[PDB]
Amino acid sequence: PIQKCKPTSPGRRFVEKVVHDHLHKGAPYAPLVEAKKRTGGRNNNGHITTRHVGGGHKQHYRIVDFKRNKDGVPAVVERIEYDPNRTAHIALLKYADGERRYIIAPKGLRAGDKVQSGNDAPIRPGNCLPLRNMPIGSTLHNVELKIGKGAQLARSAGASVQLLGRDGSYAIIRLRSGEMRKVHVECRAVIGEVSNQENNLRSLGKAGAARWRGVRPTVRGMAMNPIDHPHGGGEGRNKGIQPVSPWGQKAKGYKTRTNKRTTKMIIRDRRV
RNA sequence: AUAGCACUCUGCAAACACGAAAGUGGACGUAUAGGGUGUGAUGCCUGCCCGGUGCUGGAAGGUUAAUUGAUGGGGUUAGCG
């Protein structure tokens, strides 16, 4: 419902939050949770490789089944839960044989629904099937690129691709970036679209909200000295240069794709 | 610096960064995500110019490297003298 907070303080004047009343309010399912440590954007040499990372709240990792390799055994949804590691919600599945797992929750899925995976699964949201058995024109998510590896494409909140055609050994899908590409017909996908589609409606409101999520301040290159950045130096404000990164790579329009091995998989570019 | 705004890059063995390499961060994330650049709550808004430099897409005409080696010109000596 996108609730706006009342302007009781200047830090609250501009807070837009998203509320979903159906999320489970207790602790997560313990056998499927494991520890996760903060990195600070540093690698095994100890140097910073990604800037603006650090701090934030402590988080546990939820083990999510991306492979969906329990074929033919129906499962029932127990609850929908909030996951701090991603923007989508997750669903807890209880199988007819007692095993419990976590999956990315499709939009509309509620406690009590039934899901399945395999060649013979019926066409209902949350069911996992090979693309060869998927009806043409379907809206899908959680698309797998290598046989047996699991879902890699269209996993974020509100994400969807759609299947325009299938011929030979390759199905044609269009992605949310606007791109056409082919996928092997034996790779799997899931029926429907990802939940939490209102995720991008939130307004943080203040700097502390970004600090809670673990983002450190960005300093403009214009604000430094020549020894630090190509944009540095000068008396007063002055750009006087075509924009580049701290390492000298142009920032407006210059393309960076280099891989020559997957080029034959891409039919139509989205005007990169 | 900041929440907000915009441009641009990146289809995943991602772009990008560290490192001589192996490898590591990005991220046990997947375009509602991640990196770079500028502006800076909010209200009203944000005009003209693509000639220059840059970027993006074209063309197969001119010019041009390694490589290849067609012809031509010298040195030497069998022989003729």
Give resolution, Å, one decimal.
2.4
Strand B closer than 7 A to residue A18 Cβ: no
Expt. technique: cryo-EM
Q: Is residue A180 classed as helix, strand or coil in its secondary structure? A: strand
Q: Are A110 and A151 in contact (CB under 8 A)?
A: no
- Minimum CA–C1' distance nucleotide for A44: B24
Strand B closer than 7 A to residue A13 Cβ: yes
Closest by CA to A88, choosing from A34, A127, A128, A142, is A142
**Phi, psi of A91, rounded to the nearest 5 degrees:** -125, 140
The one-character DSSP state at A207 is H
Chain B footprint positions (protein CB, under 7 Å): 1-4, 7-19, 23-26, 28-42, 53-57
Q: Gap from A2 CA to B70 C1', in Å?
A: 83
Strand B closer than 7 A to residue A33 Cβ: no
Strand B closer than 7 A to residue A226 Cβ: no
| Strand pairing class (A114-115; A170-174) | unpaired
For A147-232, list the strands marked E by DSSP. 151-153, 161-167, 170-174, 180-184, 188-191
CA distances from A78 to A8, A27, A100 (A): 39, 14, 9
The partner residues of A4 in beta bridges, in order of sequence, read A16
Q: Which long-range contacts (CB under 8 A, 24 or more apart) does A116-122 make?
A: A116/A72, A116/A73, A116/A74, A116/A75, A117/A68, A117/A69, A117/A70, A117/A71, A117/A72, A117/A188, A118/A71, A118/A72, A119/A71, A120/A72
Strand B closer than 7 A to residue A85 Cβ: yes
